[model samples]
Target chain A: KEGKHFVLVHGACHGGWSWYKLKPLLEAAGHKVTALDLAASGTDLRKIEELRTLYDYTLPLMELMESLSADEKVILVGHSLGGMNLGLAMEKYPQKIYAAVFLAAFMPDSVHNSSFVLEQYNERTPAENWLDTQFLPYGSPEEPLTSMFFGPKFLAHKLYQLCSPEDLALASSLVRPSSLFMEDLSKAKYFTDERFGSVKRVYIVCTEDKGIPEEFQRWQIDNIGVTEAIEIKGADHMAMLCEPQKLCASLLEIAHK
Target chain B: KEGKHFVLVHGACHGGWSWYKLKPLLEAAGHKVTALDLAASGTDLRKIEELRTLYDYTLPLMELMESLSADEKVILVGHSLGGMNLGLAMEKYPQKIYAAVFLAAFMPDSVHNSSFVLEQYNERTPAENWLDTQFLPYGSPEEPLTSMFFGPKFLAHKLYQLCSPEDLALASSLVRPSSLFMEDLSKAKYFTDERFGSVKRVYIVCTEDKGIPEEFQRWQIDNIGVTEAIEIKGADHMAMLCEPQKLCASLLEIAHKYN
Candidate 1:
């Protein structure tokens, strides 16, 4: 849904880049979807002081929401933490929202409060709260998997499954740490029907998903009570990133529904 | 899809995820697809760790089936052992399955396994599969005739039917092993209709599949009550991975049913 009826939000540090492949795919199908970077994420991080509070989180979305009429509303979709924020934003301005799709939303408590959810994350575990301390050229987000997560074997494994070993190896080069906000979703209640108000919602549950397992995602859905649930089998925590078109199409179909 | 959608599954230690490229190409010609990994493969290892028995491999698929509505079903598709396991799984879970598709599946219910299926595979053997003693599973996890199985020219000769030595080498380098735990499917009763009732089935014969060689794959499906059969000209098992789009269309034609 390139320019026609889609407003895409990216996870922290992800920039508009999160939607790179997806934008073209939807556009090719004659729809418009632009994955936009929010404040403090991606290219927008230049002015950190400009975003001093939580309002900074919704400022971009609020502005976009303000412009759309009730009927001209676009599908509001977010990835990781951005997804949780979009849900909350929809609660605030339900009239301007068409539908909200959350991809790997954080576990923070609508189940309770955000803090309780943070305990479930790998980053907070004492043995490997990788982001709590450590530094790198990219500002130290997390430890990479063993072997830089690549080798002849891993490549062989990847190639046979998704594209080819060659494509899998190429994808490895493109790997980068996800947004720091991934940590925040655990502690922040970005959305609650009480605060943002009632809005149509759909969640993509990644079953083999390690980053956000299906069990945890299912917990939120059963507790939060969403309109529908979509399950992707044999996918990883980054399935959306690994095969954007497949995920994109599923989300788009639901948005249309 | 003879009547519904297709979800191609790769064999052991292999993944069907490459269907990403395969999906679009098929879609261009008006076919829908879902290429997925089996349990213990690609990204599904989390479920694999939970396995307590040989049949535990079907756990991830049981979860996948929850996503399928009664009207929607999968043509359980596989390659090599990948093909054989799904053939068995489809038998056990027919409500979730539409048909069984084997792309060079392991032998089905042969007294002597590969030999009953085809005599050529064990005949005129190469130096491959010698490292069985080094590992528990034994005899090279995969019997692939790809690069590790043959030289560049040999594979290239199989691919284009004829090509330069350098070109063949380049082609061979593109090759990788297909499966790690490809045992004969007949060992398990899941292959028979008694497990899940019978469903439509097909065997996509790779005319020049070097990995499994030709003989065994032929007998595995051709005379084994495969509902139908289709042959690819000049293609090795890896050719489906090479000319993916063309392969996708073929799979679509078989998986979907048209008036």
Candidate 2:
């Protein structure tokens, strides 16, 4: 019967604006929501080249976690690469999280390195499949970083196929460049069983997603071993846009649990 | 059957992002649409302090007008403070514009200076009515520039009353600081009969608007004497957000007549 605090995290190249539709829906149901624009993404004013590591990228989420009261805990709903950000937050401040929801997101394992899932994803999805997304190299000459911005074609066909044309237009106008920080994530001890393992994890499988196929989502769900795996039928990569009502229903149900 | 280009300009403290809902509707009706974020507004990356003159604020729109082909003419639609921007664009590139639509916007006159309408609006509306809107002084000690950002309460009660809660949320998150550049605008010869007077102007009256009331909108329309004045019933200051379909239909009708 009590209201819960929900923290929404967006995926690559997207800012807090991505949750525009869903945020209002959550609030209308008497739930508190905080949607943040990650560093260099959305309107944060940070350049993609400035992000050296995963920590630099996930600073906003980490900062939010740090700002929480000692007794308060929040439900983290992360979409796509945002799940990686949630994983980082869960590891750092495990006690602050009531439940972490992976919405067709990249769910990294505690046993394997942080970049393991990404590397696996790359191996399965061919380079040509990336379409028009630009991948530029930055950082030091010795250990360079790769930054990417989603192209219009890729966004239209893959991520937002089920979303309205207007939403796609909004995304095209607002999306910025972002990095996976895979190389740095591979080197660092990013997650642990004692820290990240303590939190309850939920994976929302988007059945119709082309960006991250259902097969890949199931593999991640099985690999990570979440507390629950919920499915919202006919949702593409952008479940928030495509299946907002269904997604909100799932989120509200999760809040009660 | 020809597709006309529609260039959308947003108001103060707002960006091109404000036209996200209306843009696709125009495009869907076989029209080329361009929504621009002026300097320091939306995601333009320029700080409010950097903007000094009216020209500095309208640089993006001017540049866009310049880039158009000599034969190409666009239908300019300006919302709220964006009407001032359209007036500036009309003065410079009168030949490039087919028609200028002022949607519940500040329609300035050619006889008076660019800041005339804004000055009148401020005189009529008291400072107390601004609600949580923040107005801070920027620039030099001698020649100070005032930058303003719309607060959530002002946006909710005045501008976006008829709009969806989601849109209000979007505006609250994305709204930035902007200046009217009154001082610089007063000094410059902004609009003239020879250039700006050449282009046809249309005024769309939003009946339910609280930000710029119907009285003020009609007063501006009468002062400027637009070619056409259409009304969208039960619409707010953000007519595009509230009555997008009706607005789109009106625009399509304008495109055929003006084109």
Candidate 3:
């Protein structure tokens, strides 16, 4: 089988380091993988205050997509909030993406604004459920932007429950502050069916994800129809850490299709 | 075993992330460990250009030392260039450091300026040996400060030869640009026998280290003089990554010595 180029996008607060485990697994299986740290996340060195919009936050991925040749198509795999980044990439470079896989990610519909799916998820999960994750206001008082840093308690109990102690420690060490850029995303141009819809979309459900529950995940899958829906049972929010082998197999399967 | 506090300091271009493997191992053995990102290093927001002095680069460790109560003492473990940071801490807060362990690190002597040992090491190792590690001038032209970012080839070939590929990848992803602060360190107050020499010093030699050779590590030990000298055979530059269990064993042995 021909090796496929897979671009791995991490969730909020996390950088490419999030895929440290999964990346090797995929590479060992003879697939080329590119994991990136989005603006202000990982070791990109950008401050969260600088990221006022979704476009600003996803600049690294955009730069990567821009650098790819006309004939070079990649499998875009985004985790959690990274799905929004995938959506933006799909709309902007539909022809460049072989397939877009949303791994327990926020899959928004082409019909609604980009922030629609996140708003629904937030409504379902109460504010108090966020635990120690601190949300602060940034930008101007007139036109505000909200940023969040995932606290250790929030990470240990919620995000990385199923992951190993070492992985959880690594996340606690590497995670930087980030934002949803919902305000800008809500106002940005809606994803066109001809652009975003033209690409093949696949959703991988993490059954045991406390952060984004199965109910919410299924709701997203129903809202944004995908070419295929696969489930990795007993996986948590960080499927890359908790169930890397299964995730790798799923990604390989997606690549073949 | 009594829970002794271990403060792990990483070398140049690396943050506390370098101690990821060792930190957990020490903790699992019922020890309290604190690993920090030294300014601009790790995820710390400060830029390398913003750091002009050794004091600025070692601020995080200094802050941690400052916060400790007068009675509280920690086992300061430093790797590679981190030995210089340990020296600064030892001189400033000697009472706070129960023991200072140099793990294949650059242990400078109190007799000469801090940069003296590094200068010797540099003179011995040729420029071509540095490979892809880029050294650039920072600060002012009149009083230039040099900063360096370890290249991937340098990391893969020299620094992390004995380490796992995943760790090599992690280091490549996390390592930022850093400086030795030689100018500031050269002019800074020499470590005094009264303050710095008062603390118990232990040196752990990484016999297989390519970045900092065993001969140089032994030279530093002889020059500075330590209470004890331990050797981790077959360990590379990043002993914490390459030989974590053995390193953990050595650390536990050190803690129990005074206890």
Winning model by TM-score:
2
Which rank order by lDDT, best down to worst? 2, 3, 1
What's model 2's lDDT at B28?
Answer: 93
Candidate 1 segments exceeding 4 Å error: A1-257, B1-3, B46-54, B107-187, B195-197, B256-259
lDDT of 1: 0.53
Off by over 4 Å in 3: none
Model 3: how far is B120 from its true place, Å? 1.5
Listing candidates in order, what is each one's chain A TM-score? Answer: 0.69, 0.98, 0.97
Clashing pairs counted in every model: 32, 0, 0
Candidate 2, position A222, lDDT:
70
lDDT for predicted candidate 2 compared with the true structure: 0.89
Model 3 Cα lDDT, one tens digit per residue, B1-259? 3588999999999987778778878999888888888888889989999998888888999999999986778999999889988888999898888899999988876778768888899899888768999899976888898899999999988888888777776777788899888778777666888888888999999998999999998998887688999999988999988998999999999998955
Q: Write the number of the candidate with greater lDDT, choosing between 1 and 3.
A: 3
Against the native complex, each candidate's DockQ, computed on alpha carbons, is: 0.02, 0.69, 0.61
Query: What are the per-model C-alpha RMSD values against the true structure?
Result: 18.6, 1.4, 1.8
With a 3 Å backbone cut-off (N, CA, C), the pairs that clash in candidate 2 are none
Error of 1 at A51 (Å): 28
- Residue by residue across A1-257, what tens digits does model 1's lDDT show? 23356777765434454465566566566666655556654333234433323456557777777777776777777765566557556756877777777776652334455434444555433433132322223223462211111233433342224333334432332222333333344435665556454677777777655445567778767666678788777665555556766786786678557
Local accuracy of candidate 2 as per-residue lDDT tens digits, B113-177: 77888888889988877899988898678898988888899999999999998888787778878
Residue-wise C-alpha lDDT for candidate 1, range B1-259, written one tens digit per residue: 3335666666543444434345556555554465565554443423333333334555555567668876777666667666555644565576677666677655453223422332334454364532221212224345311111234444444333422222232233222222232243223344444544456667777777766666666665655556677776666765455556556666777755521
